[PDB]
Amino acid sequence: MGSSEDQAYRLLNDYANGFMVSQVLFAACELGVFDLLAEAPGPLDVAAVAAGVRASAHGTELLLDICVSLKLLKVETRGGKAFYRNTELSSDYLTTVSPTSQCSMLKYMGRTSYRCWGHLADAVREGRNQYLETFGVPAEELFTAIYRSEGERLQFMQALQEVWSVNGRSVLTAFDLSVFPLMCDLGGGAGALAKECMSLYPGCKITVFDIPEVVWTAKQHFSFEEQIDFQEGDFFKDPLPEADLYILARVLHDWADGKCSHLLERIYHTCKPGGGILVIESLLDEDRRGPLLTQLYSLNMLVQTEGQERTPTHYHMLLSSAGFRDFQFKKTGAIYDAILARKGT
Amino acid sequence: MGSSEDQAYRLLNDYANGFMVSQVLFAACELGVFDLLAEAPGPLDVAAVAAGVRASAHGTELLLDICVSLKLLKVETRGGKAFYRNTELSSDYLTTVSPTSQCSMLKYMGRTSYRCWGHLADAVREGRNQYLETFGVPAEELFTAIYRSEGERLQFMQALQEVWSVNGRSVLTAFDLSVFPLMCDLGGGAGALAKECMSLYPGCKITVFDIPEVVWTAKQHFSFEEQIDFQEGDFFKDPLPEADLYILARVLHDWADGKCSHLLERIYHTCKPGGGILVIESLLDEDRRGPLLTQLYSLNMLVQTEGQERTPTHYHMLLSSAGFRDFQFKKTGAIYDAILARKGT
Ligand SMILES: C[S@@+](CC[C@H](N)C(=O)[O-])C[C@H]1O[C@@H](n2cnc3c(N)ncnc32)[C@H](O)[C@@H]1O
Ligand SMILES: C[S@@+](CC[C@H](N)C(=O)[O-])C[C@H]1O[C@@H](n2cnc3c(N)ncnc32)[C@H](O)[C@@H]1O
Ligand SMILES: [Zn+2]
Ligand SMILES: [Zn+2]
Numbered sequence A, B: 001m002g003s004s005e006d007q008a009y010r011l012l013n014d015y016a017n018g019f020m021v022s023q024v025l026f027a028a029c030e031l032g033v034f035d036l037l038a039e040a041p042g043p044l045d046v047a048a049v050a051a052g053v054r055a056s057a058h059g060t061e062l063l064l065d066i067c068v069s070l071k072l073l074k075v076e077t078r079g080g081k082a083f084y085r086n087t088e089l090s091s092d093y094l095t096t097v098s099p100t101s102q103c104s105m106l107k108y109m110g111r112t113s114y115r116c117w118g119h120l121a122d123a124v125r126e127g128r129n130q131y132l133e134t135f136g137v138p139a140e141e142l143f144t145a146i147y148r149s150e151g152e153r154l155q156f157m158q159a160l161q162e163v164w165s166v167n168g169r170s171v172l173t174a175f176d177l178s179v180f181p182l183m184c185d186l187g188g189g190a191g192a193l194a195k196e197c198m199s200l201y202p203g204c205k206i207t208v209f210d211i212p213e214v215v216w217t218a219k220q221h222f223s224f225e226e227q228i229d230f231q232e233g234d235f236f237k238d239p240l241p242e243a244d245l246y247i248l249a250r251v252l253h254d255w256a257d258g259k260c261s262h263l264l265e266r267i268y269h270t271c272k273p274g275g276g277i278l279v280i281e282s283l284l285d286e287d288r289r290g291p292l293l294t295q296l297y298s299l300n301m302l303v304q305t306e307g308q309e310r311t312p313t314h315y316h317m318l319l320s321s322a323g324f325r326d327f328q329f330k331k332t333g334a335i336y337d338a339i340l341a342r343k344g345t
């Protein structure tokens, strides 16, 4: 709030205004402000940004000035004009060329999640997702609602690959996976995690398993290399590729316990002695009261998917019931953690 | 982000997730969580909250647990159950009975502003408001779009009165207004600021001026006391009530310079020597690069109204052109500041 107001009032305003700060970041990403600034020979003024993003003078200045206050951009003065430049933050996470780019996820959060979240009170009220109430699109089959169009499936796929450029190494190296020569990424999407897995484990080979529409899009928009293979199908009913390790990264959180149990059971019966299951999810503290970002993510699963985020013990009951033993989890200090369980005799 | 990740990545996530934190606060307000907790004989468990707000168990727990992490609620343990209670923050700003309640504004930000803000990129792109693109409602006359229904006009009116319970005293006491026995609050709405003005200045009398629909709603939903009068009309063309002081609180920011100049001109020609104009707005720093909340508010005017937030110098050019002299402003340390100018001979 105001600089002299009581701390509780300032906090309440921070929370109330949060949606505005999210949209400033999302719109700056959608307009390509950071890309234009990274492609420029040096820093740019309002009129040069407004012209490059094809937007209004007043609108651009408001946007750039808010970005400076938020520490997403730096400003400098030359003559009778402000000149904007990228920060370490925006160069690393907000430019398309950066390997650690978070662009596509931000644009996705802005275009889909933000819309869904307006219906939060009803998702809480009813205990169910709101794709029909938000997009008019039936969600009886979760992913036909999520991939409501070709361009929307490419965007989802581009969005999801982005976290692995920052979190990939932590999760794949939490446990020594060199022990599993043949791997399968169930619901592997574009294959970003698999690409990382193969550079990390030179001996290993991996199959990316996903629905026919994702596999086709992955091959059409992402190039590959000699360690990675693709199998298309439905993990709830099709035969799974033979593997020593099955990886489930952000798959279990999309579904309720019963659906999770079914998939875990199929994987278990497909595994051989010494076989493993690597579950990659954001772990909830045992009291379900943190971390805050994970709690928000669990609420985002209520609003969007059929699932929730879970505690280590919850993933343990699920994996133990499916038949797995030697349950171990590793808290990475990152958004995504790793769980590994094995099949015995 | 994750507790061990780089500070820039944690900051980017804070910003990206802001919309979720806003909606948690808005939905907790819409569900009446804080009221139910204040009306209870003591602290309540998940099942008692879920039943009282008529919502799902999973949804309620997620909501309450996020509120605890956000410091909006406190939790305690008794037997095999968590018990939630209000904080100083929620009791003072989030309960309907509290005089400093911010409820109605939060519900309004959630229901209208949040929706509008999804169209931020286009409001920036085009340099205009999005009522037609968001609500289907024509905005050619700003307030017919803002008061699109009776219940929506009552909500807007209830929302706007709330800031004056906290910021009212600062703005009205920045300058000694005892010098102006007769006052007029132009666009005074429900008359919250006028009610405060009259307790602060016992000698003074005030007329609340607003559009016929607002005046009728104000008399029908708010009771009055012997110092306050109501005149209905259009400040752009109707005769203004006779007054020594004209107050413009959050009126100028809704409009562009030309519309502001027109209204200021009418007020000037209505004033007599020694007459005053009290402008109450959130002042932008001279470089237009802060405060952050004011910059967000200026962007909210681009997205919603026909105006912007302005710098002291900008309000000075406007007031000076209309004919006013002795321009003075006072930065309160709060969201809203005060500007006073006078009419000479
Ligand atoms: C939330 S995405 C996670 C993708 C990826 N593992 C990551 O973390 O970036 C869940 C993935 O599961 C895939 N999926 C959903 N249902 C499936 C099914 N029945 N059979 C195969 N793949 C499925 C989706 O198409 C999607 O790529
Ligand atoms: C943004 S509200 C501010 C209300 C109040 N002064 C406050 O700060 O809480 C602007 C007020 O101006 C009123 N208004 C808009 N156009 C008007 C007009 N042409 N004549 C009279 N009142 C008008 C609106 O109905 C509304 O109550
Ligand atoms: Zn079995
Ligand atoms: Zn168990």
Ligand SMILES: [Zn+2]
Pocket: B265, B268, B269, B322, B323
């Ligand atoms: Zn004149």
Ligand SMILES: [Zn+2]
Pocket: B316, B317, B318, B320
């Ligand atoms: Zn001037």
